[PDB]
Design a protein around this nucleic acid. Structure first.
Lengths: 411, 555
DNA sequence: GGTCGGCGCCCGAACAGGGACTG
DNA sequence: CAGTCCCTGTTCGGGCGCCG
């Protein structure tokens, strides 16, 4: 008996038409049981071929979870409804969320099933369940309520959500609560003990309205990865050539970098392994460049109207570096991950974990998901990435192949 | 007109476009008799109805012969309709494969008849399916009909039938959960572990269920005894094989012939292990006419003779056993070619296949092996829903060396080494640290955009030097040539310094094959060396002898 | 014959993007 | 400087095979 919020695509654009990729057996059995249940509770209903739209679907298991979770790849639909959840019903981003000692994420996707969807918009939430060995044709469905993973769901449910959170936000005013997709980010400066208690108070505060998760973050302990130069006491020709190449590349970020006095040590046609003593004018140009790399870049600041971009570099030995930026060489944030799950044995698992960690950080700091430049081939990625995904959102990505130049982000 | 017991799929046109209005083709007197005989029969059965001048639409129509029968099939040229109809989302996501079937006690195969003619068309859409039947006289106005069922030739007919067919089978499958029903268009593979007595009961029960919706299961197409003919295969209680394949034996081969040849060889590679189409596809490159006779090369005639010798021997596949693991083993056939066999017990292949794509100008055996594994993984997940364990002709240490040092993310699922030559290995390793006591070569190369002339050479720490003039070249080819020179005129251990990111990006990828002869010559020199160290320095920064050799190769 | 849909392969062309050099 | 230009990869459209 709830009124439906009218939604429309952006002008001059059709619905998504993306083919369903092949799914494993354990995934298809999990989707069948869920979909049959959701059909029995009226959340979804079967459709036919007259609907030309489709969206991929697969299942996941969150970190340390045994139950499967239905996940829909609405990245294409979200691009084609972008004007709705940004202009009319936007959600403000608290700049204090990233300053809290502890932030916890809560899957609140089950609440969106309580609100019906607009009848004219249900045609675009269509998806197909494949069968093993193509035994049966595609079993198609469409959503009859607010779908999980659609950007328009938290915007429609926003008015309902604020009213549920008001009695708890009043009793706890210093607590910051942000909502992105199917997740709810609750950050507080309280001690780790009474923080988790306040989470359970909320959890029961949401159970009484008709709605459980737990993943802790500590944004105050988030560090950045600067550009560092080696501290050698004896320098060879090769060492100085690598140093100049790195300093030359870093000059695109820190204009104050100079390699004039160091290049003078590379005048003769000398053997690479030959030891070169550092002149007095060069030892000062090296120390001055070390101080410039300590300084922050001039004129870097986040623009809300620009898309985030993230690049990842495989550094070997379980090391991965990343940089987030909107304009080239204006890095809003750099970093490095090490010893993630699958280190020293699996690179797709590490790359999947790194993307999730990076995206999570981008949501806490700016409330946006970056578009990734992944160092992997497309086919390698499109084969395995679903086997290691543990998150309810899916960022955008593209595939690059840049050979290592001169180790700028890792020693 | 009566109401059809099946629910009708609502179909619209694309917004803004009207129905088709195309004139009829002139038809041969033998096809007009076949059309009027079938039109008058389908109008009696309520499948086409007469229309008057109030229907301004029209579309051509013709008829082709049925295979191994005197009956004719009616087809409509809906090419102008299909353009303006709405888009459909097809529900056929692929083709079933016998390797995915499980051993069942009883098996039954049936095929309903005149499938599309047993499913109605949308009422509000029948007006756009108007066509004319030209009489034996050109002056006769002709008879105009409109379809009441799914017209053979319309783009929505297969999509609508598959979805309507699944809806009729759901109540049976919901009551009979242990019955496996493979539905492909009008063909139903039915199998169960029930005893052969209660099997035939459930079959008849299905034949009556379907009958309640206007789907007839003729006993002519009923199959109760093995072998069963399903989807181009021969199903036996313990094994399966493809329907006999016939290759043309043309004395003069045209392009179109090779295309039909290649197509059947690809179809045979699923259970016929070792089929190669490298040299036969090399005949289709750069050719423009299917009507162009083409002579067979010595390598292509040999490849054809080998493939004909594999098709003489009988091969068979087995069925899938979920209790035992899935295994896939790959071999290095030829340069750029790979084959594999998927099995659960040794020499009892579920299916075979081949991978031969060349991706890139520069590649190695390790890259192609990784691409093959991924192709097998996806194909396996389609058919069995799981990734097989892999037996690979690459040393464990060889692969560990590669993926750990490569800059891209790369990974291979659970696998084990199998010692089946030729083994995949890395043909050379670039050192990570400069070599002590090895001559250091500072190379560079440049060219002119207009003259297409350039130089390439080097300067060493021992005073050695060379510069070579080059004609009809580019900036990139010279920078590669400079590295080739340093490799030629150096000892077994050499340090090489360049300012070419292009050249360094190619060599660090450790390629063993390339489309460029200059790269293959560089590779050949790299294999002869014992230690090679490559390094990059920024150009125009007055670095070492790289600025001295930049000034020699400047023009 | 010169209908439709699905999948697979093989080739060329057309398109795309990233460098480096030059007007 | 923005414009080509040299190279490499991707996407698509066009054949054939197989199935209904």
């Amino acid at each position: 008996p709830i009124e439906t919020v009218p939604v429309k695509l952006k002008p001059g654009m059709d619905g998504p038409k993306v083919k369903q990729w092949p799914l494993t057996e354990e995934k298809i059995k999990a989707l069948v049981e869920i979909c049959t249940e959701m059909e029995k509770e009226g959340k979804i209903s079967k459709i036919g071929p007259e609907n030309p739209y489709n969206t991929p679907v697969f299942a996941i298991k969150k970190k340390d979870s045994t139950k499967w979770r239905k996940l829909v790849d609405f990245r294409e639909l979200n691009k084609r409804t972008q004007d709705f959840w940004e202009v009319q019903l936007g959600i403000p981003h608290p700049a204090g969320l990233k300053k809290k000692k502890s932030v916890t994420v809560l899957d609140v996707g089950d609440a969106y099933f309580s609100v019906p969807l607009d009848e004219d918009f249900r045609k675009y939430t269509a998806f197909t369940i494949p069968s093993i060995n193509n035994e049966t044709p595609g079993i198609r469905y469409q959503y009859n309520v607010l779908p999980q993973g659609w950007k328009g769901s938290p915007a429609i449910f926003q008015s309902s959500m604020t009213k549920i959170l008001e009695p708890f936000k009043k009793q706890n005013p210093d607590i910051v609560i942000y909502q992105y997709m199917d997740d709810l980010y609750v950050g507080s400066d309280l001690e780790i003990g009474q923080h988790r208690t306040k989470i359970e108070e909320l959890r029961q505060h949401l159970l009484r309205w008709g709605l459980w998760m737990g993943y802790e973050l500590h944004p105050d302990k988030w560090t950045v990865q600067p550009i560092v130069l080696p501290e050698k006491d004896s320098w060879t020709v090769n060492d100085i050539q690598k140093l100049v190449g790195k300093l030359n590349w870093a000059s695109q970020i820190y204009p104050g970098i100079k390699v004039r006095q160091l290049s003078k040590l590379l005048r003769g046609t000398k053997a690479l392994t030959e030891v070169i003593p550092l002149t007095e004018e060069a030892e000062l140009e090296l120390a001055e460049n070390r101080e410039i790399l300590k300084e922050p870049v001039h004129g870097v600041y986040y623009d809300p109207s620009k898309d985030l971009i993230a690049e990842i570099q495989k550094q070997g030995q379980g090391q991965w570096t990343y940089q987030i930026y909107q304009e080239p060489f204006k890095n809003l944030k750099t970093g490095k991950y090490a010893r993630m799950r699958g280190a020293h044995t699996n690179d797709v698992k590490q790359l999947t974990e790194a993307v999730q960690k990076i995206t999570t950080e981008s949501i806490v700091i700016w409330g946006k998901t970056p578009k990734f430049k992944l160092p992997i081939q497309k086919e390698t990625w499109e084969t395995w990435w679903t086997e290691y995904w543990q998150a309810t959102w899916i960022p955008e990505w593209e595939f690059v192949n840049t050979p290592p130049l001169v180790k700028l982000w890792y020693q | 007109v009566p109401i059809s017991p099946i629910e009708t799929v609502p179909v619209k046109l694309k917004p803004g476009m009207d129905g088709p209005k195309v004139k009829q083709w002139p038809l041969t007197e033998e096809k007009i008799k076949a059309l009027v005989e079938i039109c008058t029969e389908m109008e009696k059965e309520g499948k086409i109805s007469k229309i008057g001048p109030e229907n301004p639409y029209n579309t051509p129509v013709f008829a082709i012969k049925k295979k191994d029968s005197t009956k004719w099939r009616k087809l409509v040229d809906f090419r102008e309709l299909n353009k303006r109809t709405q888009d459909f989302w097809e529900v056929q996501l692929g083709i079933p494969h016998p390797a995915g079937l499980k051993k069942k006690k009883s098996v039954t195969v049936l095929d309903v008849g005149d499938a599309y003619f047993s499913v109605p068309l949308d009422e509000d859409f029948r007006k756009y399916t108007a066509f004319t039947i030209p009489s034996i006289n050109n002056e006769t106005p002709g008879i105009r009909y409109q379809y009441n069922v799914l017209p053979q030739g319309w783009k929505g007919s297969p999509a609508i039938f598959q979805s309507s067919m699944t809806k009729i089978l759901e109540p049976f499958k919901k009551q009979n959960p242990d019955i496996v029903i493979y539905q492909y268009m009008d063909d139903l593979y039915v199998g169960s572990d029930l005893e052969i007595g209660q099997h035939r009961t459930k079959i008849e029960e299905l034949r009556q269920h379907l009958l309640r919706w206007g789907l007839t299961t003729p006993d002519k197409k009923h199959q109760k005894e093995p072998p069963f003919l399903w989807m181009g295969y021969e199903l036996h209680p313990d094994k399966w094989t493809v329907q006999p394949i016939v290759l043309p034996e043309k004395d003069s081969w045209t392009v179109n012939d090779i295309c039909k040849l290649v197509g059947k060889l690809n179809w045979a590679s699923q259970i016929y292990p070792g089929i190669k189409v490298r040299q036969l596809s090399k005949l289709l490159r750069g050719t423009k006419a299917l009507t162009e006779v083409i002579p067979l090369t010595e390598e292509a005639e040999l490849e054809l003779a080998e493939n004909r010798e594999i098709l003489k021997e009988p091969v068979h596949g087995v069925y899938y056993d979920p209790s035992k693991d899935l295994i896939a083993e790959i071999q290095k056939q030829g340069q750029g070619q790979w084959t594999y066999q998927i099995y659960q017990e040794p020499f009892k292949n579920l299916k075979t296949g081949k991978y031969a794509r060349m991706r890139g100008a520069h590649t190695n055996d390790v890259k192609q092996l990784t691409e093959a594994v991924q192709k097998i993984t996806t194909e396996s997940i389609v058919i069995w829903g799981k990734t097989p364990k892999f037996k690979l002709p690459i040393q464990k240490e060889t692969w560990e060396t590669w993926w750990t040092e490569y800059w891209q993310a790369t990974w291979i699922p659970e696998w084990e080494f199998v010692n089946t030559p030729p083994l995949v290995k890395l043909w050379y390793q670039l050192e990570k640290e400069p070599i002590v006591g090895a001559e250091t070569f500072y190379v560079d190369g440049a060219a002119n955009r207009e003259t297409k002339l350039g130089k390439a050479g080097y300067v060493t720490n021992k005073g050695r030097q060379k510069v070579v003039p080059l004609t009809n070249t580019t900036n990139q080819k010279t920078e590669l040539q400079a590295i080739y020179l340093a490799l030629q005129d150096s000892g077994l251990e050499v340090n090489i310094v360049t300012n070419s990111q292009y050249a360094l990006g190619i060599i660090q990828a450790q390629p063993d094959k390339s489309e460029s002869e200059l790269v293959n010559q560089i590779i050949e020199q790299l294999i002869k060396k014992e230690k090679v160290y490559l390094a990059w320095v920024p150009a125009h920064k007055g670095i070492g002898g790289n600025e001295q050799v930049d000034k020699l190769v400047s023009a």
